[PDB]
Paper text:
The biocatalytic reduction of the oxime moiety to the corresponding amine group has only recently been found to be a promiscuous activity of ene-reductases transforming α-oximo β-keto esters. By studying the crystal structures of enzyme oxime complexes, analyzing molecular dynamics simulations, and investigating biocatalytic cascades and possible intermediates, we obtained evidence that the reaction proceeds via an imine intermediate and not via the hydroxylamine intermediate.
In general, XenA structures showed a better-defined electron density for the substrate when prepared by soaking, while for OPR3, clearer results were obtained by co-crystallization. As an additional aspect of the crystallographic study, the structure of XenA with 1b might explain why only XenA efficiently transformed substrate 1b, and OPR3 did not. A closer look to the active site of XenA revealed a pocket delimited by the residues A57, I66, H178, H181, and Y183, which is not present in other previously investigated enzymes. Therefore, the presence of this pocket in XenA might explain why it is the only enzyme able to reduce oxime 1b efficiently and why oximes with substituents larger than an ethyl group are not accepted as substrates. Remarkably, a non-canonical tyrosine residue was found to contribute to the catalytic activity of the ene-reductase OPR3, protonating the hydroxyl group of the oxime in the first reduction step. Comparison with the other previously investigated enzymes revealed that this tyrosine is structurally conserved, though in class I/II OYEs, it is located close to the C-terminus of the enzyme (Y370 in OPR3).
Residue numbers in the entry: 9 to 290, 296 to 385
The structure:
Amino acid sequence: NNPLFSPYKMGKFNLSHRVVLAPMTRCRALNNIPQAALGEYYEQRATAGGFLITEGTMISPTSAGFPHVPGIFTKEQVREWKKIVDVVHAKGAVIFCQLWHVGRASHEVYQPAGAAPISSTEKPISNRWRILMPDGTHGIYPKPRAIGTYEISQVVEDYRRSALNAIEAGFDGIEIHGAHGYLIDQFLKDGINDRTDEYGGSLANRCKFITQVVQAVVSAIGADRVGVRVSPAIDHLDAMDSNPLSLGLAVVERLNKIQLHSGSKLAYLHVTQPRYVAYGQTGSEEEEARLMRTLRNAYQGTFICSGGYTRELGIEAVAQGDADLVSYGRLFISNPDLVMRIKLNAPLNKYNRKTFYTQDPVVGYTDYPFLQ
Ligand SMILES: Cc1cc2nc3c(=O)[nH]c(=O)nc-3n(C[C@H](O)[C@H](O)[C@H](O)COP(=O)(O)O)c2cc1C
Ligand SMILES: CCOC(=O)/C(=N\O)C(=O)CC
């Protein structure tokens, strides 16, 4: 009776329900090494036939813009990820590793040798935004270094190698974080990308980087193990575009083309609701709904929606055909058994923003209780 619990074939993965763990940075992976705490956390939230997406994971030493976020670019990181994937698979869940490069959304403190973060541009995020520092204070986003096309090709290889490392750790697949003003989105958004070479200017040129990243990982591990996350309209880290809908449709067209040329469909397209922001709660609601349905209708495959969803809104999204899967973030922080609570329509427990990004392996992380 609940459409969130009708099964869904996500390529080769048979999911038993459509409630997805959205990718959430939590900063418990001390020194960028996956910790046992992550295993307990993902294990708590894993269900038989349920789909989990990990926190954004570094693809290279320049990828981070948060403290104690995990990487998957070293063999040490792969070894520790394997233990976490093992306990998630022990419960019959499917798990993808989100590959995350923040680009200009970093700080000297997070870069090797304190170097400038890399980006499409030299323009910094404005002082409207602040970066969380390792000591819990807020820092200023610095001026990034605009990389050339050889360096771009090396970042693409960082995605390729990290996708292979994810498969070696036992992940079922990876998600490309191409959203929220991070590195890929710094190429996509014409409010950021001021390049005059073949990666800037036109919409085709601005889409080159994400196309090359997706093509690289598809070639490496197979289309059916690759999800792609974008957010054509978002209020995060000055990632504006003059025509968000056309930008989204240009990206979708390239994903459709990659699928045709590879003869296989991606695992999914994951799109953030424009209402979702990092700095608080929640143009017009109809324009935002138009954008989501337009992208879904344009994409030849599985659509995951995310951002501000509740039990009722997730049911509606699946019932109306607005999405195939619904990913939940904050409610999954505070309800380890969110899937069961949604099935039972049991009351949900509140989440505590204060411990979203702290380092404690337990407090605010794995000590939210299950249903009594
Ligand atoms: C603490 C926190 C960390 C997040 N980290 C990521 C991330 O690393 N990568 C990403 O794509 N989205 C990230 N998100 C956005 C979520 O994936 C998800 O889309 C969002 O939380 C959905 O909205 P909801 O919290 O109302 O369910 C994060 C959200 C929160 C609250
Ligand atoms: C508001 C959209 O941005 C996000 O959700 C996000 N990463 O993708 C973060 O907040 C970094 C922790």
